[PDB]
């Protein structure tokens, strides 16, 4: 169909759960044997969320190359993303090692450190200019350079130093701070504004390594971000924008990481965002 009329037809027929279940039944199943090795148990936040072996990011290490992170490579749209879990106390040094080694320019964070009264990820960046962080396991230093706090998001300028080579790189931290503890936003307007601030920065462009995107598990909000970005780019590239099929794009992305879009409400929100962004 076309998207906006497919949308009203699923709303009127109340069939979001059935459409979402169809996607779950058709999604790819690839092995994740490295994720399940006993030596990696304290590197995974959730036992049911693992990177596939074929698409996992490898750390440049001989002892243990494992991180819970996946490369999503979208061939027609010419976009790549790394989707990862919120870092754990034992994996903050691995996280910044990955940003360094993959030549990323941007980190996109879609969660708060505490939500629903529980910790959803480690405090993995410095909160004050004069109190830098040193990750001794991976030999990196991270400094807060500047902060811009807005109503719906915060952007930070960070300096990452490889202490082995004394090389430095600027990293941009894009923090969406207002996703609700339960459900999805009522309007996609602030999420779309945020997506276009990340684009404007150069963080999604081919002159850099892939953007690093995370939430708590790195599949639900994180999936919504990459799915909306890729669908809007395809609508600009093709002769017939109404040919873009959001369900087919999501199944392509599910070849590279399991579980992207965690609820029927996140699926409806992704349709809403693409429909409103197209205008």
Ligand X SMILES: Cc1sc2ncnc(N(C)C)c2c1C
155 binds ligand X (CB under 6 A): yes
CA separation for the pair 178, 184 (Å, rounded): 10
Single out the residue of 146, 151, 164, 166 in contact with ligand X (rule: CB under 6 A): 146
Least spacing, CB of residue 98 vs ligand X, in Å: 12
Only segment of 20-28, 192-200, 253-261, 265-273 that touches ligand X (CB under 6 A): 192-200
* 226 annotated to a ligand binding site: no
Contacts of 266 (CB under 8 A, 6+ apart): 184, 220, 221, 223, 224
CA separation for the pair 61, 97 (Å, rounded): 10
Only segment of 74-82, 105-113, 125-133, 188-196 that touches ligand X (CB under 6 A): 188-196
Q: How many amino acids of this chain bind ligand X (CB under 6 A)?
A: 16
46 binds ligand X (CB under 6 A): no
Least spacing, CB of residue 26 vs ligand X, in Å: 30
* 67 annotated to a ligand binding site: no
Least spacing, CB of residue 235 vs ligand X, in Å: 10
Single out the residue of 36, 41, 54, 58 in contact with ligand X (rule: CB under 6 A): 58
121 included as an active-site residue: no
CA separation for the pair 165, 244 (Å, rounded): 46
Question: Could you say which residues in the range 199-228 bind ligand X, by CB under 6 A?
Answer: 200-201
* 220 annotated to a ligand binding site: yes
Q: Which is nearer to ligand X, 97 or 161 (CB)?
A: 97
Contacts of 59 (CB under 8 A, 6+ apart): 65, 66, 67, 94, 97, 98, 101
Contacts of 180 (CB under 8 A, 6+ apart): none
Please say whether the beta carbons of 179 and 187 come within 8 A: no
| Binding-site annotation, residues | 181, 215-221, 262
Enzyme catalytic residues: 215
Interface positions with ligand X (CB under 6 A)? 58, 60-62, 146-148, 155, 157, 172, 192-193, 196, 200-201, 277
| Binding-site annotation, residues for substrate | 181, 215-221, 262
């Amino acid at each position: 169909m076309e998207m906006e009329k497919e949308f009203e037809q699923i709303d009127k027929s109340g069939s979001w759960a059935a459409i979402y279940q169809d996607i779950r039944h058709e999604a790819s199943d690839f092995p994740s044997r490295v994720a399940k090795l006993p030596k990696n148990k304290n590197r995974n936040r959730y036992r049911d969320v693992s990177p596939f072996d074929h698409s996992r990011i490898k750390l440049h290490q001989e002892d243990n190359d494992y991180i819970n992170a996946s490369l999503i490579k979208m061939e027609e749209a010419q976009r790549s993303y790394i989707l990862t879990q919120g870092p754990l106390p034992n994996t903050v040094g691995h996280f910044w090692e990955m940003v360094w080694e993959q030549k990323s320019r941007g980190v996109v964070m879609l969660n708060r450190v505490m939500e629903k009264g529980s910790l959803k990820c480690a405090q993995y960046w410095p909160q004050k200019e004069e109190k830098e962080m040193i990750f001794e396991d991976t030999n990196l230093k991270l400094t807060l350079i500047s902060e811009d706090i807005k109503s719906y998001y915060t952007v930070r300028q960070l300096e990452l130093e490889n202490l082995t080579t004394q090389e430095t790189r600027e990293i941009l931290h894009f923090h969406y701070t207002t996703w609700p503890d339960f459900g999805v936003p009522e309007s996609p307007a602030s999420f779309l504004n945020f997506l276009f601030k990340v684009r404007e920065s150069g963080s999604l462009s081919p002159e850099h390594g892939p953007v690093v995107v995370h939430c708590s598990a790195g599949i639900g909000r994180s999936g919504t971000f990459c799915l909306a970005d890729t669908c809007l780019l395809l609508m600009d590239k093709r002769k017939d924008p109404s040919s873009v099929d959001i369900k087919k794009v999501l199944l392509e992305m599910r070849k590279f990481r399991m579980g992207l879009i965690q609820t029927a409400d996140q699926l409806r929100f992704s349709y809403l965002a693409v429909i409103e962004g197209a205008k």
